[PDB]
Amino acid sequence: SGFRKMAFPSGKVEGCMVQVTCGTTTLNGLWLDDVVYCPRHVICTSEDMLNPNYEDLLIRKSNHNFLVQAGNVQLRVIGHSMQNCVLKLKVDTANPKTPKYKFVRIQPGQTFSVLACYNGSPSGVYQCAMRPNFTIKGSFLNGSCGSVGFNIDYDCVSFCYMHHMELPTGVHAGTDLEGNFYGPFVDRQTAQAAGTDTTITVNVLAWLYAAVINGDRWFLNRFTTTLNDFNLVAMKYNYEPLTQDHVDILGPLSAQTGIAVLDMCASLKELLQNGMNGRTILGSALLEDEFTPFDVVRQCSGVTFQ
């Protein structure tokens, strides 16, 4: 028993991280086959970041202006291109540690592990969620750029996130591996509105099912509700509306615990309307929404990788 905010084992991603240097700028790159992927703002100076014309900047750069280092050894860059907000550096050697991999663009609410790196070396690994407003609440310092978020499935790594930017409000924004930002954000040192964040209702419900599985169930109430009635309460407390899809996805946890989804919704309703009243759920004094139903099933059944 027990429930932790568990990250994927990082080993497969560790072997892909490299350092990319251009001018005075250094950040992390992801080396897969004979391509290195990194944020295109590697080509910028602090001055350029105010208002970069990335086309104009990249034109000044040649293959040899990109130093890629994997440990001690230099990779030779024989080609470069800009796809959206990422730079693709073709190198002459294939990464011998390349895992089976996909690029995926995940939906709001989904979760992944971040491998936080500096100078192409990992510092740590943590689990986080793509917020409804397409930001993440990560842990990123100067030089963290190029760090990636990912999911593993048996032996296949699914890369979903590359870190590009901390907003003025201290929250984090980035792209998929095709370099398309999550959300409205641009790679420019400018004030940028993230917009209203919302709580990921289905994830909270998943986490409540986790709590019941692990014996924590004081919050189970005598009430039920409807999807509409619940949603009225959801909008008030800045929760995402609950669909039959979300209800369907919770089916397994409902089947394992014998608690109907709408009964758990009623319990959740009461927690929102009355607060948690000084008590805790799975060591938390607030409603956690960083666990997808899939995360709960993974953790509580001990699914393995490699």
Added chain:
Amino acid sequence: SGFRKMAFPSGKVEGCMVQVTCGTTTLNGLWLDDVVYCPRHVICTSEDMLNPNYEDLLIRKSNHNFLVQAGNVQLRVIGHSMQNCVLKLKVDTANPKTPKYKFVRIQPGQTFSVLACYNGSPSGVYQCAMRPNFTIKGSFLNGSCGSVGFNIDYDCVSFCYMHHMELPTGVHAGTDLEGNFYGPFVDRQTAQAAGTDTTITVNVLAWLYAAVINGDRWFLNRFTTTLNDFNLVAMKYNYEPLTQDHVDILGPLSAQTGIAVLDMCASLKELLQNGMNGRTILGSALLEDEFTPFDVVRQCSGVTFQ
């Protein structure tokens, strides 16, 4: 900026995990050089676990009764010995992925990353602390045994924990890599008292310094206190007493933030006496004690490994 419960990159430990089978029992082993380390209760049946004579049980076993599997390949066991509560299986092949490593016995309050494994394959990685009462609040299912906790320093892995047991109260207990349990616990299916847990005061203080570094500082009060006066309040709320050692260890965070330790103690005092009043600190509605001062400095300065 931002602050996460970050685990170490697990890659170096992934390459050490193996499956150990004896009779019908299977659990995780740690393969370092030509030795595999695993819990000695691998030799038990469900019946034996009530009251095992480990000496008597092990005597019935020979080298060939231990199947060690690293992926597809079998390791050949050419020797076995019992050190305290761990079994050491000498194998004929050295692990080619052996990292630079130490065995350390950590103190209460210190932190480490757990790599949760099943059948010698990792499921996930999370950060936790050795509770003052020598338990850990982990995430462990049947078959999780042999899973290890560790710290990394540049390229050296320091193994501090091997998982052996979930207590009836759903908390977790284990040994160092020399097989000596943390705390009073024995490897027997019996009711076992963990004793009163306490909050790791120095870690809470560290985390408050982290909070100030990351702009969260509403909790900063107008008051100061003494070490004695603070400690009086500490004992009341089940906090560990604060020593000059702990004050000394917080020095760096005090120097970075310009907040004297005893002023932060006063702030902490007020949070304990008045509660958090519906507000949050670094996304938490309670006082986190799983971050050592070293963890805070690591995270907030982006220290790397490999």
